[PDB]
Ligand binder design. Structure first.
Ligand SMILES: *[C@@H]1O[C@H](CO)[C@@H](O[C@@H]2O[C@H](CO)[C@@H](O[C@H]3O[C@H](CO)[C@@H](O)[C@H](O)[C@@H]3O)[C@H](O)[C@H]2NC(C)=O)[C@H](O)[C@H]1NC(C)=O
Ligand SMILES: *[C@@H]1O[C@H](CO)[C@@H](O[C@@H]2O[C@H](CO)[C@@H](O[C@H]3O[C@H](CO)[C@@H](O)[C@H](O)[C@@H]3O)[C@H](O)[C@H]2NC(C)=O)[C@H](O)[C@H]1NC(C)=O
Ligand SMILES: *[C@@H]1O[C@H](CO)[C@@H](O[C@@H]2O[C@H](CO)[C@@H](O[C@H]3O[C@H](CO)[C@@H](O)[C@H](O)[C@@H]3O)[C@H](O)[C@H]2NC(C)=O)[C@H](O)[C@H]1NC(C)=O
Ligand SMILES: *[C@@H]1O[C@H](CO)[C@@H](O[C@@H]2O[C@H](CO)[C@@H](O[C@H]3O[C@H](CO)[C@@H](O)[C@H](O)[C@@H]3O)[C@H](O)[C@H]2NC(C)=O)[C@H](O)[C@H]1NC(C)=O
Ligand SMILES: *[C@@H]1O[C@H](CO[C@@H]2O[C@@H](C)[C@@H](O)[C@@H](O)[C@@H]2O)[C@@H](O[C@@H]2O[C@H](CO)[C@@H](O)[C@H](O)[C@H]2NC(C)=O)[C@H](O)[C@H]1NC(C)=O
Ligand SMILES: *[C@@H]1O[C@H](CO[C@@H]2O[C@@H](C)[C@@H](O)[C@@H](O)[C@@H]2O)[C@@H](O[C@@H]2O[C@H](CO)[C@@H](O)[C@H](O)[C@H]2NC(C)=O)[C@H](O)[C@H]1NC(C)=O
Ligand SMILES: *[C@@H]1O[C@H](CO)[C@@H](O)[C@H](O)[C@H]1NC(C)=O
Ligand SMILES: *[C@@H]1O[C@H](CO)[C@@H](O)[C@H](O)[C@H]1NC(C)=O
Ligand SMILES: *[C@@H]1O[C@H](CO)[C@@H](O)[C@H](O)[C@H]1NC(C)=O
Ligand SMILES: *[C@@H]1O[C@H](CO)[C@@H](O)[C@H](O)[C@H]1NC(C)=O
Lengths: 133, 97, 269, 97, 35
C-alpha cells in the first residue's frame, strides 16, 4: 500500500536510498518487489557560507544552499549541482548581519534592477532626443 | 593449498571523513538502481483427522479414545482456523483494487 | 557498511557532544552515559544447562554505535542514502528547522541560546540516569524472567513425580533390573513434560523479543538516519534528531525534540 | 449516513463479537472437561474417595489428576497465544490513534 | 463567498519602487523645464 500505490518518504522502507516507485511480482507462496531507487554518484568539494550580507542586511536562500567555487557565489539544490545567479527571488531578508555567526561578505543582485535600469537608459535617451527638435 | 583459518571478523572498511566548518560537497551525477525484496505471504493448508491418525480404522481404539473428551475437536478447530487464516492473508495482500 | 571516524577537532559551533562521543582513555571505546547504562544493569551448568556467548562482542557493538553517531553529526542524513557528504553542524540544524516548518533564520539568530539549552538538557538526562533506577526495568525484567525460568527448570528435578525416590542412583541401587522399570517411566514422563513446558515458553518469549528488535530497527532507520514526520514516533513533540547508545541486551535512544513554550492571544481573519 | 449504517447491520461488529465468543467457547470447553473419565471408573472425585480403600482411591485420582492437569496446560497455552494477537492489535490501534 | 472576511488595505513592494521612480521622473521633468 505504501510503496506501489504512491511514493513513500520513509527512509530505507521502499528500498535503500531515495525511493521513486516499485513493481510487484508473484511467486510461489510469496511476493517479490522490485524497488527503484535514486542514488547520487559523483561529488565535489565547495566553499559555503550560512548567510550573505549585502546592504547591511542578512539574506538567506528561499530554496537551496549558498555555494561558491572560490570566486563567485551561487545557490544550488541539496542533492544535485545546479548553479544560479543570486537574485531577489532566491533570497529573503531578515534581521541584521551581526547575530549571524560566520556571515560572509558579497553583493546581492536584484533581477528587477536591470529591468528598471533598461527603462532608465531608455528614458535618458528619450530625454536627450527631446532636446533635438 | 586450502585450509581452515580463524580470524577476528572485520567490522567493515574503515573510512575517515574530512569535516570542516565551511565546506560542503554537492553531487553532480547520479545512478538509478533496482533491488529485489522477498517476503513469505502464506503456507500450505493442512488438516489432520484426529481419530483416523490416533486409532486408524479400529473400533476398540475408537472406544478407548472416546474417554479423553474433546481433544480431537480442539485440534480440528485449530487447524481449520489456520487454514482460513491463510486465505485471509492472500486476500489482504493481493486484493487491493 | 563503512565505519566513519570522528574528526580530532571538536569545533561544532558551540554544541558539546563530549558526553555521547566515546572516550579513548577507557580500554573500550565506551562513552560516559554508556558506562552508566552498563553499571545500572546487573547482568545450572552441571545438569547440562549451558549458556553460549554472543557473536557480536560489546566492543564491536560500541564501534557500530560510534560510527553511526559520527556519521550523523558530520553529514546529516546523507550517509544512510548515498555517498557521505560533509556539512557544517550549524547548517544541519537549520535544515532540521526547515524540516519541521520553521524558517531557518531562527538558528542564525538564536545559536548561542539553543546551544546552551541543548547542553543543559544533556546534563539533565545525565543526572536523571545517574539518579533513578526504575528506568531500566524494561531490561532488568527480561533478565529476571530468563533467570527465573531456568531456576524453576533446575528445581524441577527434586520432585517425586509419583515415584519412591527423586534420585536416579538411589532407585537403581536399591531395585534390581526388573521392578526398577516401573519407577524409571514416571521420572522420564515427568521430566519430559517439564522440558516441553520450558521450551514452549521460550518459543513465545523469543517471538516477543524479535518483535521488539524489529520495532527498534524501524526506529533506528527512521529516526537516526533521517528526520521523521510521524507524530509522537521519534519522541513527544516536534522531532529534530536522535542519538543511539548501547546497553546490555538492548539499546537506548536520546530523542531531541522541539516544543513551543510561551503563547499569546491575538485577533485573526 | 454512518449512524444509519451502524444502526442497520450486525455483521460489522464481528471483530469484537469474535473476541468475546472465542473466550466464552474456550472456557466452556474447560468446564465440560470435568465430566470425562480419563480412563478411570468414575468422573466424580467424591465417589472415588467414598468408594475403595485409601490406597487404590488415590491411584484412580492420579489418572484424574494427570488428565485435568493436561487440560489446564492446553487452556493456558491457548490463552497465551490469544493474548499476543490482542496486544499486536492494541499496538496497531495505538499507532493509528 | 468567504465568510468573515475583514476589511484592510493590501500593500505592494513594487508600488513604492515605482513611486520613487515616478517622483524621480517628475523631478527630472521639473529640472528639464528649467533651462
Ligand atoms: C567559478 O565559477 C564561476 C561561474 O561559473 C566562473 O566564472 C566564469 O568563468 C568563465 C570562464 O571559465 C566565464 O566565461 C567567459 O570567459 C571569457 C572571459 O573573457 C569569455 O571570453 C567567454 O566567452 C565566457 O563568456 C564566465 O563569464 C564567468 N562567470 C562569472 C559569473 O564570473 C569562475 O571562473 C569559476 N572559478 C573556478 C576557480 O572554478
Ligand atoms: C563586507 O562589507 C561590509 C560593508 O562595508 C564590511 O563591513 C565594514 O567593516 C569595516 C571593518 O570593520 C567597517 O569599518 C569600520 O570599522 C571600525 C568599526 O568596528 C571603525 O573603527 C572604523 O573606523 C571603520 O569605520 C565598516 O564600517 C563596515 N561597513 C558597514 C557598512 O558595516 C565587511 O567588513 C565586509 N566583509 C569583510 C569580510 O570584510
Ligand atoms: C563539554 O562538556 C564536558 C562535560 O561537562 C566538559 O567537560 C567538563 O569540563 C569541566 C571543566 O574543565 C570539568 O570540571 C573539572 O575541571 C577541572 C579538571 O581538572 C577541575 O579543576 C574542576 O574543578 C572540575 O573538577 C568536568 O569534569 C568535565 N566533565 C567531563 C565529563 O569531562 C567540557 O569541558 C565541555 N567542552 C566544551 C568545549 O564545552
Ligand atoms: C471594507 O471595504 C469595503 C469596500 O468599500 C466595504 O464594503 C462597502 O460596504 C458598504 C456598507 O454596506 C456598502 O455601502 C452600500 O451598502 C448597501 C449595499 O448592500 C447599499 O444599500 C448602501 O446604500 C451603500 O451603497 C459599499 O457599497 C461597500 N463597498 C463596495 C465597494 O461595495 C466594507 O464595508 C469595508 N469593511 C467594513 C468592516 O466596513
Ligand atoms: C574533498 O576533500 C577531501 C579532503 O579535503 C581536502 O584537503 C586538501 C588536500 C585540499 O585539497 C582541500 O581542498 C580538500 O577539500 C578529500 O579527501 C582526501 O582525498 C585524498 C585522495 O582523494 C586522500 O589522499 C586524503 O587522505 C583525503 N583526506 C582525508 C582527510 O582523508 C576528497 O577527496 C575531496 N573530494 C574530491 C571529490 O576531491
Ligand atoms: C488568552 O485568553 C483567554 C481568555 O480570553 C480572553 O478574553 C478577554 C478577557 C480578552 O483578554 C481576550 O483578548 C482574551 O483572549 C485566557 O484564558 C483565561 O485564563 C485565565 C487565567 O489566566 C482564567 O482565569 C480564565 O478562566 C481563562 N478563560 C476561560 C474562558 O477559561 C488565556 O489565559 C489567554 N492566554 C494567555 C497566554 O494569556
Ligand atoms: C572554522 O574553524 C577555524 C578554526 O579551525 C576558525 O578559525 C574559523 O573562524 C571557523 N569558521 C567558522 C565559519 O566557524
Ligand atoms: C526622437 O523623437 C522623434 C519624435 O519627436 C522621433 O521621430 C525620433 O525617431 C526620435 N529619435 C530617437 C533617436 O529616438
Ligand atoms: C463569531 O460569533 C459571534 C457570536 O458569538 C458572531 O456575532 C460573529 O459574527 C462570528 N464571527 C465569525 C467570523 O464567525
Ligand atoms: C538638471 O539638468 C542639468 C543638465 O544640464 C544637470 O546639470 C543638473 O544637475 C540637473 N539638476 C538636477 C537637480 O537634477
Amino acid at each position: 500500500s505504501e510503496c506501489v500505490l504512491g511514493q513513500s518518504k520513509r527512509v530505507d522502507f521502499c528500498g535503500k536510498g531515495y525511493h521513486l516507485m516499485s513493481f510487484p511480482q508473484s511467486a510461489p507462496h510469496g511476493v517479490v518487489f522490485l524497488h527503484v531507487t535514486y542514488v547520487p554518484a559523483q561529488e565535489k568539494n565547495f566553499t559555503t557560507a550560512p548567510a550573505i550580507c549585502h546592504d547591511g542586511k542578512a539574506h538567506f536562500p528561499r530554496e537551496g544552499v549558498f555555494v561558491s567555487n572560490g570566486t563567485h557565489w551561487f545557490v544550488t539544490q541539496r542533492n544535485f549541482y545546479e548553479p544560479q545567479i543570486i537574485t531577489t527571488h532566491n533570497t529573503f531578508v531578515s534581521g541584521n548581519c551581526d547575530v549571524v555567526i560566520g556571515i560572509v561578505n558579497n553583493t546581492v543582485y536584484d533581477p528587477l534592477q536591470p529591468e528598471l535600469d533598461s527603462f532608465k537608459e531608455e528614458l535618458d535617451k528619450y530625454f536627450k532626443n527631446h532636446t533635438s527638435p | 593449498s586450502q585450509s581452515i583459518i580463524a580470524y577476528t571478523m572485520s567490522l567493515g572498511a574503515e573510512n575517515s571523513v574530512a569535516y570542516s566548518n565551511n565546506s560542503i560537497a554537492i553531487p553532480t551525477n547520479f545512478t538509478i538502481s533496482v533491488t529485489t525484496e522477498i517476503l513469505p505471504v502464506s503456507m500450505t493448508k493442512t488438516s489432520v483427522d484426529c481419530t483416523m491418525y490416533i486409532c486408524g480404522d479400529s473400533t476398540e481404539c475408537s472406544n478407548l479414545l472416546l474417554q479423553y473428551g474433546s481433544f480431537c475437536t480442539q485440534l480440528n478447530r485449530a487447524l481449520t482456523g489456520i487454514a482460513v487464516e491463510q486465505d485471509k492473508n492472500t486476500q489482504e495482500v493481493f486484493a487491493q483494487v | 557498511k563503512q565505519i566513519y571516524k570522528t574528526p580530532p577537532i571538536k569545533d561544532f559551533g558551540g554544541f558539546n557532544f563530549s558526553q555521547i562521543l566515546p572516550d579513548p582513555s577507557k580500554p573500550s571505546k565506551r562513552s560516559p552515559i554508556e558506562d552508566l547504562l552498563f553499571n545500572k544493569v546487573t547482568l545450572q551448568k552441571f545438569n547440562g544447562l549451558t549458556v553460549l556467548p554472543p557473536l557480536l562482542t560489546d566492543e564491536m557493538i560500541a564501534q557500530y554505535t560510534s560510527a553511526l553517531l559520527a556519521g550523523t553529526i558530520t553529514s546529516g542524513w546523507t550517509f544512510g542514502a548515498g555517498p557521505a557528504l560533509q556539512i557544517p553542524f550549524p547548517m544541519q540544524m537549520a535544515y532540521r528547522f526547515n524540516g519541521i516548518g520553521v524558517t531557518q533564520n531562527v538558528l542564525y539568530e538564536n545559536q548561542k541560546l539553543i546551544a546552551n539549552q541543548f547542553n543543559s538538557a544533556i546534563g539533565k538526562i545525565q543526572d536523571s540516569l545517574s539518579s533513578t533506577p526504575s528506568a531500566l526495568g524494561k531490561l532488568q525484567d527480561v533478565v529476571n524472567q530468563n533467570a527465573q525460568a531456568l531456576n524453576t527448570l533446575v528445581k524441577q528435578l527434586s520432585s517425586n513425580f509419583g515415584a519412591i525416590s527423586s534420585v536416579l542412583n538411589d532407585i537403581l541401587s536399591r531395585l534390581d533390573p526388573p521392578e526398577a522399570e516401573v519407577q524409571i517411566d514416571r521420572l522420564i514422563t515427568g521430566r519430559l513434560q517439564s522440558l516441553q513446558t520450558y521450551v514452549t515458553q521460550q518459543l513465545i518469549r523469543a517471538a516477543e523479543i524479535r518483535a521488539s528488535a524489529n520495532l527498534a530497527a524501524i526506529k533506528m532507520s527512521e529516526c537516526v538516519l533521517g528526520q521523521s514526520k510521524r507524530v509522537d514516533f521519534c519522541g513527544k513533540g516536534y522531532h529534530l534528531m536522535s542519538f543511539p547508545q548501547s546497553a546490555p541486551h538492548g539499546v537506548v535512544f536520546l530523542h531531541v525534540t522541539y516544543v513551543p513554550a510561551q503563547e499569546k492571544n491575538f485577533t485573526t481573519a
